[PDB]
């Protein structure tokens, strides 16, 4: 199990600015907030199971 995994996705600066550390899936059904799992050779979506290249 991974604890407080959602926190790792976001970094917040001292000024309160929130920056996303992971990319979102472009699938319309997935919509915003569905985050691609970062693998060494690919970006994977856990919802629609789509695969995207890391530098695409």
């Amino acid at each position: 199990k991974v604890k407080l995994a959602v926190l790792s996705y976001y970094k917040v600066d001292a000024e309160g600015k929130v920056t996303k550390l992971r990319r979102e899936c472009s699938n319309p059904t997935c919509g915003a907030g569905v985050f691609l799992a970062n693998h060494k050779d690919r970006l994977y979506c856990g919802k629609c199971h789509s695969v995207y290249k890391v530098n695409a």
């Binding site: 699938n27 319309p28 059904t29 789509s50």
Partner: protein, 255 residues
């Protein structure tokens, strides 16, 4: 007959060959389709279309959320008739009586016999106390008549269902309870015999309920005490023996 049989065997193998071919063609189709997976998904995504519940459907979703606010009724089982209960009780009495007769005549439950054992014999909040001393500390400050209350509370506080491991904790407490029953008898009690008689038999009644579920833990403690009495007898003879041993031998007959 033989020609019919070679026909049947041949017919079976011929279909068995067809199914395997049909299975093979299907796997080939899937593999080819998977290779074209990326190409098909591309345009299909490009054509993805752009961006009310039935009033019956609303009510069901509404309904479920009120029911959680409500309290839940306890379900009950069908009541057996007095005749059925008596017949069931009579049936159990018959079985237990028959088993006792069988064991009386040499039936040994592991159903072996006594003669089998004779091979090679002659040739060669509330804390649950795991130890007896722990129980006394908990009941150190109480009157004698209050021992059944804490002993019963320890059982209630540690039933098997409340948490995992409570069977073992009560299993050890069954042994600890027995060492308490014999321990109290050793202690002097002529001053308050009536009070002692109220606690000692109450504890024995509790110990009987434990034995029904934890006889194996009780049996091990019983056999250890028999070793302890023997060992003390070897060095002190009668001086080792006490009133606790006389009480102990009696409880074993009960349980």
């Amino acid at each position: 007959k033989a020609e019919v049989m070679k026909e049947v065997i041949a017919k079976s193998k011929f279909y068995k060959q067809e199914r395997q071919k049909a299975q093979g063609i299907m796997e080939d189709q899937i593999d080819n389709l998977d290779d074209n997976f990326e190409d098909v998904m591309s345009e299909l995504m490009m054509t993805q279309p752009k961006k009310p519940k039935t009033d019956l459907d609303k009510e069901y979703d509404i309904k479920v959320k009120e029911l959680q606010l409500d309290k839940r009724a306890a379900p009950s089982d069908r009541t057996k008739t007095e005749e059925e209960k008596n017949a069931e009780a009579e049936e159990k009495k018959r079985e237990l009586e028959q088993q006792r007769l069988d064991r009386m005549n040499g039936m040994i439950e592991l159903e072996r016999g006594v003669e089998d054992l004779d091979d090679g014999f002659w040739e060669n909040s509330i804390s649950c106390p795991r130890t007896h001393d722990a129980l006394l500390d908990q009941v150190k400050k109480l009157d004698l008549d209050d021992h059944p209350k804490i002993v019963k509370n320890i059982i209630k506080a540690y039933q098997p269902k409340l948490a995992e491991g409570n069977k073992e904790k009560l299993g050890k407490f069954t042994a600890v309870l027995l060492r308490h029953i014999i321990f109290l008898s050793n202690q002097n009690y002529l001053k308050n015999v009536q009070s002692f008689k109220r606690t000692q038999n109450a504890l024995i009644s509790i110990l009987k309920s434990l034995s029904e579920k934890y006889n194996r833990e009780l049996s091990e403690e019983c056999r250890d005490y028999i070793n302890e009495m023997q060992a003390r007898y070897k060095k002190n003879h009668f001086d080792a023996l006490s009133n606790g041993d006389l009480v102990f031998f009696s409880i074993i007959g009960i349980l």
